[PDB]
Amino acid sequence: EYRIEHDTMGEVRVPAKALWRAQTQRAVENFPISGRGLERAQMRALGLLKGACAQVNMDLGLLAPEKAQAIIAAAAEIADGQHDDQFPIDVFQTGSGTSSNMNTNEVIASIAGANGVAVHPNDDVNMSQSSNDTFPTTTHIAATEAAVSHLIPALEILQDALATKALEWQSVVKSGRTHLMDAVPVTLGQEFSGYARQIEAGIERVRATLPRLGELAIGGTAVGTGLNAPEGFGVKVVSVLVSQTGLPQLRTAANSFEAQAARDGLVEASGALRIIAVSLTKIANDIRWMGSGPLTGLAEIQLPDLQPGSSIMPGKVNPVLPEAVTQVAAQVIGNDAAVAWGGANGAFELNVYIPMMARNILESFTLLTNVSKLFAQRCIAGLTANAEHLRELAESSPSIVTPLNSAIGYEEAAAVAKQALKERKTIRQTVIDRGLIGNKLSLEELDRRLDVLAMAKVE
Amino acid sequence: DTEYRIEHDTMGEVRVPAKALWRAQTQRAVENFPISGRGLERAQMRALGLLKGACAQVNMDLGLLAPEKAQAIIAAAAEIADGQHDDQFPIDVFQTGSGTSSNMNTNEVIASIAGANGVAVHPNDDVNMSQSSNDTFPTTTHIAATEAAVSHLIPALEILQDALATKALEWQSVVKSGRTHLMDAVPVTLGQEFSGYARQIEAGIERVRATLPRLGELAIGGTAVGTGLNAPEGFGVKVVSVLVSQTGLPQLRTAANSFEAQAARDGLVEASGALRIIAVSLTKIANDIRWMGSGPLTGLAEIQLPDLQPGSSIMPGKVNPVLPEAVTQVAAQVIGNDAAVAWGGANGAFELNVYIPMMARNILESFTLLTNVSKLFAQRCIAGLTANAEHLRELAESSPSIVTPLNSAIGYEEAAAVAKQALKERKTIRQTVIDRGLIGNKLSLEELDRRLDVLAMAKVE
Amino acid sequence: EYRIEHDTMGEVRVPAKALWRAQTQRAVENFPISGRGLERAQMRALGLLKGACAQVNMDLGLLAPEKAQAIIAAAAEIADGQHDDQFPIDVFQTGSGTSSNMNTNEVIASIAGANGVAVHPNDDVNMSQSSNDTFPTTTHIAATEAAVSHLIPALEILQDALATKALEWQSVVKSGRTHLMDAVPVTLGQEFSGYARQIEAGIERVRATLPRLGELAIGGTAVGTGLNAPEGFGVKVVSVLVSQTGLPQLRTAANSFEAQAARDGLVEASGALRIIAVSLTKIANDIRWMGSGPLTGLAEIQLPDLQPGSSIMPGKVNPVLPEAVTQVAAQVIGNDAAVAWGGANGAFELNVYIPMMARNILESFTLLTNVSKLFAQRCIAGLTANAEHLRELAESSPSIVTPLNSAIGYEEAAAVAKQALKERKTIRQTVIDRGLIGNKLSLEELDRRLDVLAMAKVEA
Amino acid sequence: DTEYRIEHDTMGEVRVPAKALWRAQTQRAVENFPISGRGLERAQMRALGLLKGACAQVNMDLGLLAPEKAQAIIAAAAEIADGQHDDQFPIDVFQTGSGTSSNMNTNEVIASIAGANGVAVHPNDDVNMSQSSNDTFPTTTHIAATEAAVSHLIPALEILQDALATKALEWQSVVKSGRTHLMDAVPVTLGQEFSGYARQIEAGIERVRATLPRLGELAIGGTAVGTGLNAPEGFGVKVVSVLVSQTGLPQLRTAANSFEAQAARDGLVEASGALRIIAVSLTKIANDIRWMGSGPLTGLAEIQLPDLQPGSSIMPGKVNPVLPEAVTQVAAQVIGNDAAVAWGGANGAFELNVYIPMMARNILESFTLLTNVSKLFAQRCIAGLTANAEHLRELAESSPSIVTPLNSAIGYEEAAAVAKQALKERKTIRQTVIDRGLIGNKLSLEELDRRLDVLAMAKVE
């Protein structure tokens, strides 16, 4: 069954039980493109913002209290997730988010009406607002919340897991590799201190975006001038948003025209996630190479078994968490290109790529948050080192000749390494065989310098 | 709900939701990869069902799989292919990069369906007989992508090409000013411009078709590493024959090289690259159309787009080019998806590229978005455009560059002085040519008028 | 003619007058790929770093003063650009920069030898060093210098030019446009204040990368452990570098393994340039659209003529500086993808994409620096506004009905706007014709609300 | 030198360096675009010279340009095409996006050369007769790109394909352990892996060839906006005939649609996309090769790469895989260049895409990098690889996954227990099968040894 609703273009048949109205239904028919709509966090921010705007409009005497309280109560239901099935509009809608803004206005109107209070979706629920400031405001609320409350705490869990291994393995000597070739000794702990620093720097990179990611366009209305909103509307709404979210990073935009003509802060936020994707690729690739084998690979560490590896090769177990991490990183890199493409292509007073940009930046936050915690807890925490094998690798590298450079010179040290490899002799015995024990190098000094744990220079 | 049953695999016991048709390995993957909250698409589960039925058919034909087991597997696989069990595939896209988990998801659900019908089949020994995830999962990916290209995207692009070509003919004499660098140029017709858009989409179809010889290559039969170990001789060729008969897609074929087909996913990178060009073309077409529709009074106002919904929650009565916005946002998504596909494609190792589920998600999404938005763009926007022909002819006549056909008579430098003086003095080109004393042995008044006619200047063919 | 030099792989024929030696010549033959090598700024940083390392090795008593002074003098010649033609190696060399490191070591050895001092390219000129810490150090020196001393000052020039127009045009009313459609009034000044903020925020974005862009790997030697360098070598060398460059943004890396296993700071710096490319695309596109015409476009502003526009259409002039800007932005976006691709693909103790990453990040700094200044000085500064045309456009938008929403309601205001367009009437006359003057809207209030300059709500 | 002479264009007089062969408009562009400090490449100036000569030839054939003038332009254009005047093209890549400046650069230098030979020709009226920048500059870009693809890149890829295919044959029986997910898998041969690499390069050639029908499309004849205004009937067809005769490239053709050919550069996006796939393939090949050469003692040590230079300024005697490093860095550059090309390609407006010089720079660079590094990779790395065959056969025999052929005899789950017990007790698969009491009616000792032979397991025949 259907019922008739109307907008300024005419009457529209709407499913009888739906809480949306005419403009949402038009958008259902105009944009059946991906079949996916707003995320939970986006509908939360829309509900939060519509409640805050009604509160301020009531505070200022522009909106009657009976109407404002009914809107506040309905918006709270939306923010809480009680009506997510009432937001059927595709991501790939009009690029201002007008349709999803009106979706929220219409659903609020229907909830309020069922409670005996008539509010107009435009005149009341959208009072003092445009899609052009509210929709990017909800996007930046959701992204700031994702960065502060979800991603950074997940990166902290991962940094801690890596740093714990850096400490546990501080004296687990192994052969360094550069260009994939035998190098001088390092410890596993040293390598994991590098990974931990990459994640720590990732947190610094996300934090550096927050002063502009947290900028909200609310109050600029149609074009940035604030037309049809009272003086200070944006400042007053942001104050309510900070109180409701506990996110002091939210703020009014430095320039109200920049905040609507562009979404540069979303490009910036995505760029930090892109670096984290780059860092995680290196960490996860190293960890699965360390776990490669057990007999045809490096066999440096053992990853926790998480599931049977193979439908055909029995007993084989694969590095599935590194695979999830590196695939997530690839997705973040692609999403980042989509965000930047949208960001560059604003025109005059409005960038109309907001729903697409919002989808991609919020997804990148979600993927990185979730996979970083899983990587920490289901992979890093349970790694074990094959320390005996690692020392054997360290002692087998021909590059352990390197600390002899100051005693015999680079060219002779190179001759030592090549002869040792050719004759399948040790560095120590080749140094002796080449007659190098003498005024420039004693046996005692040779053995001191070839000690691989000392050569790793553990701090 | 807290109701569970205990299933097991070679790794141990797992609690599984009591009503779920999946079993231990799927449940492990549910707990290992809660990353995006989104799993396989309908088309991926369709291809998994189709492939598992085809493998059972061939194993049975060869006498390797008992007919009673084969019947139960074929019937269960058909239910999956038909979409009766999509809620039984809970595994994230961001799973192990071979698709082992979704392969085992299919094997386990088939075993549960067959068991409910009174036939015991083993998910590994029977449902996965002669198979690996490493050949079956990219096979289902290339089936789904080939089907998307041939049966969905190309028909949608044909609809859009036809709508653009129809306007190219309808508007073949609707003269307007060309614009180059956004500046007044010489006359064109709207129809000429739309013939260009139509060619871009026609070329886009050519680009998709050019990918099909390699997009349609399937790894099936190569099993674990490409050698076909534990598969019967010619198993993959026989399975592809079933797949071709079942899908009606002659583009499906065994891979030229069985190692290339598992060590790499270069065919998906190739297919994505064609979609990327289409995104590039659509961006130009959609941008031109919304600029031509800009206004009503402060823009170019060359054409009118069909109204599709109220434009604005605050500015009353305003209507916006929402379909060009959907197109250009889809194009941005395809560009990003394409970068993700190429990133995964480059990073295979030895016998297997383990980025398949991510690559699959992105290529299939790009196919879906372009298919759906191209049809909407054609039918809800292009088909109903109207032209503001009087305004367009005035624009054509107003460009100072209509002096251009006089180059051979008065020379480039004098023609430039004509154009600059006409604009400064707010005079027509014709009157400025007269005022500068250029009418004479080199240029008659009748010749001037012939050369300045803007419709003739568009050289409509 | 040729002479023989040797390395640990054997003897190599080297052009007789070349200052490089065996390992540089091998690299000439191994990597003829792009035909382009290190940039001036990269050879400057190599010379600076080799001089600083010799200074510290001498300070610590590890390198004899006669050798150290000869290396310092030779390295200064290289830093000053006296020997750029002695660096023939392709960008697309071994990904540690080993070849360019040895190029610098060999050229220094030859210069010192011609001055009568023998120094060994490995034992002396490379003392306490690896390619794996020195080459990324020189890259981060060059990139930090580019950010601080070249790009930020150029962006400040552009921000100032945009802000000056924001003030000059503070009250030049026009029609806003959203979705390319007629919107409510703005001023040209307000739009240019938005552009100025984008560039100001771009400077903030570059500044934010400096704490990690300025991290130097020097001292970590082969793998990050500092093997074969004295205690505190990196700290001592960075101190010399800071004193020599005046760039206290340069600093020792927080973690010596991160600083060699990855080049994440270059990815970060490129990402800031990518945002600036995104911002400049919007600014330049708006400016060329506002200049479009003269008679078939928006014709809001006049760009300074810079050159004849057209070889065929006579007297036509085109927005060439916006075109240069938007093409530079495209290049930065592509370079940025190359940098990130290299950044992700390190292995164990070393990322071996450094020469390629260095090329792309330094190019993006150069292009953005140079085009930002040209954009400011050859385009923005000389823009003129077509103020009467702009005022007419402001008055022509049907959306000037918007301030009546609180008096007549959204739905009636929409009917007013649609009827005004259909009948080719003003909003004011349509309001009157629809009988809306009354207890909800007086004629005086209608005229107060339809004032388009007041509707733009110019501040300050 | 500070001496100047006066030249002029339609904007006024310009001081030009006294000895420069360029004139007023080139000098303006020198001052307008000091951005990268790099200008056109050799191949771009060659194509400009070729095209200007062809246009003068056709204008002479049609009686539109006097033979003495046409001959002098043809001679000057040939001097430019052959490289005698490359220092007379000082304009930046990042110029006006139609290439107007480089077009006028060519027109002005030709006029000066002709004048020094005693023949007066006007840069616009004569040297640019029947032409626009908007058709000639993309025409020269597509000539250069088509030539790069056909005459340089494809032959270089054939050298690499041949090198890989030769190793596939040489190593067809060199058994080793497969690796999937980086973990021990079932046997393959090095030859099989290299047959996969060879197919990747063969497919890369197919991908480049597939772009040629549209890469070879030339805009010449469309002049300002695609209408052909101010060019004689059939001018483009006649010029293309000259270009095909002179270059020997039958792929050069008139564009299917003259508006698409100037409003967009979609064929450059398409050509770049094929190079992007080649970069993806080469990354996989080069990564595998440097991993196989990793060591000598702490890595996989499967093969030995030719020594090309000392590896390390500090670690003595170390040698590094420098050619795989060059390949993978070139691939990164191609990926980035490809993103730049697509960005420019999407952003045309109305009758002209004004990103041509930037797009030209990036596509032509990608062709050059891939051509040169593919040949070096083949000749300085692939051809000289040697295999460590004894070590490889030991790796093949060491993989616990060689239990796989026993699946049909003992079942997947019991085979898992065999592989697991073998690893725990450091015993062979064969011994573990005996120790678990599996020899009997289902599996004999002779059948076990047949199934465990690793070279037979690689299924080379």
Buried b or exposed e, range B360-381, using 16+ CB within 10 angstroms: bbbbbbbbbbbbbbbbbbbebb
**What is residue D230's DSSP assignment?**
T
Is D391 annotated among the ligand-binding residues? no
Interatomic CA distance for residues C223 and A456, integer angstroms? 9
Q: Could you tell me how many CB contacts below 8 A there are between chain A and chain B? A: 232
Determine the residue of chain A that is closest to B34 in CA distance. A370
**What is residue D181's DSSP assignment?**
T
- H helices then E strands: how many in chain A? 18, 8
Catalytic residue (one of B173, B312, B408, B444): B312
Q: How far is D38 from chain A (nearest CA, A)?
A: 26
Joined together, the tokens standing for residue B77 give: 């696989």
> Are the beta carbons of A292 and D407 separated by less than 8 Å?
no
Beta strands D253-254 and D217-218 are parallel
> Are the beta carbons of C312 and D32 separated by less than 8 Å?
no
CB C319 within 8 A of CB C326: no
Interatomic CA distance for residues A342 and A350, integer angstroms? 12
Identify whether A243 is a catalytic site residue. no
Q: Residue A139: which of A266, A23, A22 has the closest Cα?
A: A266
CA distances from B179 to B185, D172, D258 (A): 5, 61, 15
Residues 6+ apart with CB under 8 A from A104: A43, A46, A47, A50, A75, A78, A87, A125
> Are the beta carbons of C267 and A278 separated by less than 8 Å?
yes
**What is residue D171's DSSP assignment?**
T
Joined together, the tokens standing for residue C165 give: 């127009």
Quote the radius of gyration of chain D (alpha carbons, Å): 30
> Are the beta carbons of A8 and B95 separated by less than 8 Å?
no
Joined together, the tokens standing for residue B31 give: 């707990």
Residue C350, Ramachandran bin (φ over 0: left; ψ between -120 and 50: alpha; else beta): beta
Interatomic CA distance for residues C103 and C42, integer angstroms? 12
Identify whether D181 is a catalytic site residue. yes
For chain D, which residues make up each domain, given as ranges?
5-131, 132-401, 402-457
Interatomic CA distance for residues A303 and A9, integer angstroms? 61
> Are the beta carbons of C95 and D362 separated by less than 8 Å?
no
Touching chains, A (3+ CB pairs < 8 A): B, C, D
Q: Within chain A, what is the greatest distance between any pair of CA atoms?
A: 102
Q: Within chain C, what is the greatest distance between any pair of CA atoms?
A: 102
Residues 6+ apart with CB under 8 A from B67: B60
Q: Residue D323: which of D390, D377, D245, D246 has the closest Cα?
A: D377
Report the residue from B184, B299, B412 with minimal CB separation from C314. Answer: B412
Q: Where are the alpha helices (DSSP H) in B123-218?
A: 133-147, 154-170, 190-215
Q: Residue D294: which of C332, A180, B149, C188 has the closest Cα?
A: A180
CB B317 within 8 A of CB C417: yes
Interatomic CA distance for residues D184 and C198, integer angstroms? 53
Q: Could you tell me how many CB contacts below 8 A there are between chain C and chain D? A: 231
**What is residue D349's DSSP assignment?**
B
Determination approach:
X-ray
CA distances from A165 to A132, B54, C254 (A): 48, 48, 18
Interatomic CA distance for residues A254 and A266, integer angstroms? 15
Joined together, the tokens standing for residue B60 give: 């049975």
> Are the beta carbons of C318 and B180 separated by less than 8 Å?
yes
- Helical (H) or strand (E) element with D253: strand D253-254
Q: What number of other Cβ atoms are within 10 A of residue C133's Cβ?
A: 31
Q: Collapsing DSSP states into helix, strand and coil, what is residue A276?
A: helix
Q: How far is C340 from chain B (nearest CA, A)?
A: 11
Mutation target to probe the C interface, by most C beta carbons within 10 A, among D7, D28, D135, D329 is D329
Burial of C17 (0-12, 13-18, 19+ CB in 10 A): exposed
> Are the beta carbons of A311 and B104 separated by less than 8 Å?
yes
Alpha carbon D280 to its chain's center: 11
Catalytic residue (one of D151, D245, D312, D398): D312
> Are the beta carbons of C224 and A402 separated by less than 8 Å?
no
Joined together, the tokens standing for residue C13 give: 């024929």
Quote the radius of gyration of chain C (alpha carbons, Å): 30
Give the annotated binding-site residues of C: 96-98, 120-123, 130-132, 178-179, 311, 316-318
Residue type, D184: D
Q: Residue B81: which of B109, B100, B61, B62 has the closest Cα?
A: B109
Place of tokens 């796989």: D404
Q: How far is D314 from chain B (nearest CA, A)?
A: 30
Alpha carbon A452 to its chain's center: 39
Q: Could you tell me how many CB contacts below 8 A there are between chain A and chain D? A: 158
From chain D, the residues in CB contact with C131 under 8 A are: 312-314
Interatomic CA distance for residues D81 and D85, integer angstroms? 9
Half-sphere exposure of B167 (CA within 13 A, CB side): 26
Interatomic CA distance for residues C28 and C12, integer angstroms? 11
Q: How far is C312 from chain A (nearest CA, A)?
A: 30
- How many degrees, rounded to 5, is the angle at CA A294 between CA A289 and CA A297? 45
Catalytic residue (one of A34, A149, A171, A310): A310
CB C317 within 8 A of CB D317: no
Interatomic CA distance for residues C45 and B260, integer angstroms? 44
Alpha carbon C41 to its chain's center: 15
Interatomic CA distance for residues B116 and B137, integer angstroms? 26
Report the residue from B224, B325, B343 with minimal CB separation from A333. Answer: B343
Buried b or exposed e, range C259-298, using 16+ CB within 10 angstroms: bbbbbbbbbbbbbbbbbbbbbbbbbbbbbbbbbbbbbbbb
> Are the beta carbons of A274 and C340 separated by less than 8 Å?
yes
Interatomic CA distance for residues B32 and B165, integer angstroms? 51
Q: How far is D310 from chain B (nearest CA, A)?
A: 27
Interatomic CA distance for residues A366 and A372, integer angstroms? 10
Q: What number of other Cβ atoms are within 10 A of residue D425's Cβ?
A: 11
Q: What number of other Cβ atoms are within 10 A of residue B444's Cβ?
A: 12
Is D373 annotated among the ligand-binding residues? no
- How many degrees, rounded to 5, is the angle at CA A183 between CA A182 and CA A187? 110
Report the residue from C95, C228, C330 with minimal CB separation from D343. Answer: C330
Residue type, D406: L
From chain C, the residues in CB contact with B316 under 8 A are: 399, 401-402, 405, 410-411, 413-414, 416-417
From chain C, the residues in CB contact with B341 under 8 A are: none
Catalytic residue (one of C310, C396, C406, C442): C310
Interatomic CA distance for residues A132 and A259, integer angstroms? 10
Joined together, the tokens standing for residue B357 give: 């589920």
- H helices then E strands: how many in chain B? 18, 8
Interatomic CA distance for residues D105 and D118, integer angstroms? 20
Residue type, B9: D
Determine the residue of chain D that is closest to A319 in CA distance. D181
> Are the beta carbons of D318 and A183 separated by less than 8 Å?
yes
CB C22 within 8 A of CB C5: yes
Q: Angle, nearest 10°, between helix axes D356-377 and C320-344?
A: 30
CB C174 within 8 A of CB C392: no
- How many degrees, rounded to 5, is the angle at CA D457 between CA D452 and CA D461? 140
Q: Collapsing DSSP states into helix, strand and coil, what is residue B447?
A: helix
Interatomic CA distance for residues C416 and C418, integer angstroms? 6
Q: Where are the alpha helices (DSSP H) in D148-263?
A: 154-170, 190-215, 235-247, 260-263
Buried b or exposed e, range C342-363, using 16+ CB within 10 angstroms: bbbbbbbbbbbbbbbbbbbbbb
Interatomic CA distance for residues B226 and B254, integer angstroms? 12
Joined together, the tokens standing for residue C83 give: 């020997």
Interatomic CA distance for residues C159 and C170, integer angstroms? 16
Q: How far is C154 from chain A (nearest CA, A)?
A: 20
Interatomic CA distance for residues D255 and B203, integer angstroms? 12
Interatomic CA distance for residues A361 and A358, integer angstroms? 5
Mutation target to probe the C interface, by most C beta carbons within 10 A, among B289, B297, B338, B452 is B297
Q: Collapsing DSSP states into helix, strand and coil, what is residue D461?
A: coil
3-state helix, strand, coil split of chain B in percent (to 5) is 60, 10, 30
Place of tokens 């007629």: C182
3-state helix, strand, coil split of chain D in percent (to 5) is 60, 10, 30
Beta strands C251-252 and C215-216 are parallel
Joined together, the tokens standing for residue A332 give: 């973040």
Interatomic CA distance for residues B296 and C393, integer angstroms? 11
CB D50 within 8 A of CB D87: no
Q: How far is D138 from chain B (nearest CA, A)?
A: 14
**What is residue B304's DSSP assignment?**
E
CB A40 within 8 A of CB A81: yes
CA distances from A405 to A173, A183, C153, D186 (A): 22, 15, 45, 44
Interatomic CA distance for residues C319 and C293, integer angstroms? 11
* Dihedral (Cα; A43, A47, A49, A55), 10-degree rounding: 180
Mutation target to probe the A interface, by most A beta carbons within 10 A, among C63, C186, C348 is C348
Touching chains, C (3+ CB pairs < 8 A): A, B, D
Q: Residue B313: which of C399, A43, C185, A72 has the closest Cα?
A: C399
Burial of D28 (0-12, 13-18, 19+ CB in 10 A): buried
The 3-class SS string of chain C reads CEEEEEECCEEEEEECCCCCCHHHHHHHHHCCCCCCCCCHHHHHHHHHHHHHHHHHHHHCCCCCHHHHHHHHHHHHHHHCCCCHHHCCCCCCCCCCCHHHHHHHHHHHHHHHHHCCCCCCCCCCCCCCCCHHHHHHHHHHHHHHHHHHHHHHHHHHHHHHHHHHHHHHCCCCEEEEEECCEEEEEEEHHHHHHHHHHHHHHHHHHHHHHHHHHCEECCCCCCCCCCCCCCCCHHHHHHHHHHHHHCCCCCEECCCCCHHHHCCHHHHHHHHHHHHHHHHHHHHHHHHHHHCCECCCCCCCEECCCCCCCCCCCCCCCCCHHHHHHHHHHHHHHHHHHHHHHHHHCCECCECCCHHHHHHHHHHHHHHHHHHHHHHHHHHHCCCEECHHHHHHHHHHCHHHHHHHHHHHCHHHHHHHHHHHHHHCCCHHHHHHHCCCCECCECHHHHHHHCCHHHHCCCCC
From chain D, the residues in CB contact with A180 under 8 A are: 290-291, 293-294, 299, 321
Quote the radius of gyration of chain B (alpha carbons, Å): 30
Mutation target to probe the B interface, by most B beta carbons within 10 A, among A306, A323, A363 is A323
CB B433 within 8 A of CB B443: yes
